[PDB]
A paper describes a structure:
[name] is a chromatin remodeler, a member of the SWI2/SNF2-like family of enzymes that couple ATP hydrolysis to repositioning, ejecting, or restructuring nucleosomes. [name] (also known as [name] and TIF1β) is the major interaction partner of [name], with the two proteins forming a tight complex (Okazaki et al., 2008, Rowbotham et al., 2011). The [name]-[name] interaction is direct and involves the first [name] CUE domain ([name]) and the [name] domain of [name]. Remarkably, [name], a canonical CUE domain, recognizes a cluster of exposed hydrophobic and surrounding charged/amphipathic residues on [name], which are presented in the context of a coiled-coil domain, not in a structure resembling ubiquitin.
The structure was initially determined from a cubic crystal form to 5.5 Å resolution by single-wavelength anomalous diffraction, using the intrinsic anomalous signal of zinc ions. During model building and refinement, significant disordered sections of [name] were noted in the electron density maps. Electron densities for the first B-box domain could not be seen in the cubic form crystals ([name] [name]-[name] CUE 1,2 complex), nor could its zinc ions be located in anomalous difference maps, suggesting that this domain does not associate with the core, an interpretation supported by limited proteolysis experiments (data not shown). In both cases, the dimer interface is extensive (∼5100 Å2) and formed primarily by the antiparallel association of the coiled-coil domains, with some contributions from the RING and second B-box domains. In both structures, electron density was only observed for a single CUE domain, which we conclude must be [name] [name] based on our biochemical data. Our structural model shows a single [name] [name] domain bound to each end of the [name] coiled-coil dimer.
Residue numbers in the entry:
A (entry chain F): 59 to 94, 113 to 137, 203 to 409
B (entry chain A): 59 to 94, 113 to 137, 204 to 408
C (entry chain D): 151 to 203
D (entry chain B): 146 to 202
Write the structure that this text describes.
Amino acid sequence: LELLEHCGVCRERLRPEREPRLLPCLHSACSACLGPTVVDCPVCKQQCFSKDIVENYFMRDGERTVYCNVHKHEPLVLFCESCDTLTCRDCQLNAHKDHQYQFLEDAVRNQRKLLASLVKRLGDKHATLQKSTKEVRSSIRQVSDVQKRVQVDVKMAILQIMKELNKRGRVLVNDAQKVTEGQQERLERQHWTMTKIQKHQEHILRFASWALESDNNTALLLSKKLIYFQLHRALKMIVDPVEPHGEMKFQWDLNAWTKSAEAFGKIV
Amino acid sequence: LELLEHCGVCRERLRPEREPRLLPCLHSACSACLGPTVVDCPVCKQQCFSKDIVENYFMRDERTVYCNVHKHEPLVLFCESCDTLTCRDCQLNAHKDHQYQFLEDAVRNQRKLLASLVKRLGDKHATLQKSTKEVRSSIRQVSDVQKRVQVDVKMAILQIMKELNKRGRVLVNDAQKVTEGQQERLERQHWTMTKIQKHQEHILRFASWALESDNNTALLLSKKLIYFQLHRALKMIVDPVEPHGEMKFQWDLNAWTKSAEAFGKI
Amino acid sequence: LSELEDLKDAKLQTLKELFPQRSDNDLLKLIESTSTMDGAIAAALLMFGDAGG
Amino acid sequence: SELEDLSELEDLKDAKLQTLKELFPQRSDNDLLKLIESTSTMDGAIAAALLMFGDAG
Ligand SMILES: [Zn+2]
Ligand SMILES: [Zn+2]
Ligand SMILES: [Zn+2]
Ligand SMILES: [Zn+2]
Ligand SMILES: [Zn+2]
Ligand SMILES: [Zn+2]
Ligand SMILES: [Zn+2]
Ligand SMILES: [Zn+2]
């Protein structure tokens, strides 16, 4: 639209005086925009030698006439059907003598009607691409959302597995805890026994010590109770407790089977 | 010490006028502390009938006590044939030519035997005083064994979790690598499609304008049908068809939760 | 057999030391029922009768 | 029949070459051909290889 009419580097309007040439890649620019062997495009590439570079004929609005290559001021008007291009009257007499021949008017109608068919077909083909572009553009968003969602699905499944596993482990831990404190409360009676026995002995002992230390005119008072001092001394003489030993098996009740843990965690 | 001298419920100082008595359990209290058949202790038991209850004689600072029978004739002498003391009358009466002894020798001997009894019993109550602290420390030790097992279990758990999250995130990096390789391919393909669509859109735009201007331009147009149809062969078989990478990463998450719970139970 | 009698009487005196209020004939039946274990006797003593220090 | 299939294959290769020319055009045709043969003519793997040796735009 705004871009075709204008030239290459200068973006000048199609000046026929500018000697504008047309490259194989269909862009157009004046030979004053690019001079230099094989000539390349300002956008595409050096798709062809300079030998296959025709000059753009776009002289808008009195040059409806364009003049032949060879026969000078004899203008091209006629179409050589055997050469796919145009010639003036003379070339058709010399070079194209009895070469299959067409006039502009019928050839232009037929050629416009065939190029319009090619154009409609390629336009209906390029519509499918202007659609498949948005198709893949949305496929990217869907693939990325699904990638993030599978990436999160795996993690949340693993986290749920871990949650239930920690519950089922902490349960057995609390079980061992209950067992241990039950066992300790059962062995606890021995401190009860020791303490009460120590108290009876301490009463008796207190007494004995004071009894001896007072010896000033106390041979009488003392001499009366030897029997019962030795009687509760038989009481504290055979007190009868033997300390048992609760073996430590809490070291061998941790299930340390780690080699199986790693094996089952490898696959998932 | 502060508690021996005092009485029973009243904790009065040993008043000899209080007629204090002494129980078989060795506590001492005035018969004004407990009155009522078999008599029991303020601390121990009714360890004996009242018949075996002697009055406590503790008259601090009346050193003398007089005989039971012969009234004011005091006991000083030791009747060796009756394990106790008598006054002069009983050793002429009751214990006449019973084999005899005086106070001094039997007192020395009795002190020397009771001291031996006391010393050995003290050496044994010392073993009590040490075994008490021994078992007291053993109790804290067993409680600490429980606590240390409590920690050992958790740390085995956590080490298992560590190596598991390693062997799990290593497999998660496979999902990372795949998802991003497929996305690298999708980026490549969308990029190709976009750049090709733009080349086609330039070709199409220019050709479309050049043709739509067909009023008094057949001269200018007919000169270029060759290269028109050439780039039309370019855009005719442009040669890209959209393939689709199916999603089967949905069938790659190893969700065998039942096996997990089965192995975690034990 | 005169040894077993003192072996029983020792534990009986110990029970009188522990819980004294209970009569002696009562404690005898229990020291027999336990077959004279040092601590299980104390357990069965907490069972019936007062069970607090 | 086999000759017809071969003449089809020729056009099949040339079309992919024309796409390469539409994409990165400056590299010679004799260069693009060795690569479309190397790739065994995959429509996207050809383009990835084109990005590989050359530059990065
Ligand atoms: Zn210019
Ligand atoms: Zn260009
Ligand atoms: Zn001709
Ligand atoms: Zn001519
Ligand atoms: Zn009192
Ligand atoms: Zn008492
Ligand atoms: Zn006598
Ligand atoms: Zn007398």
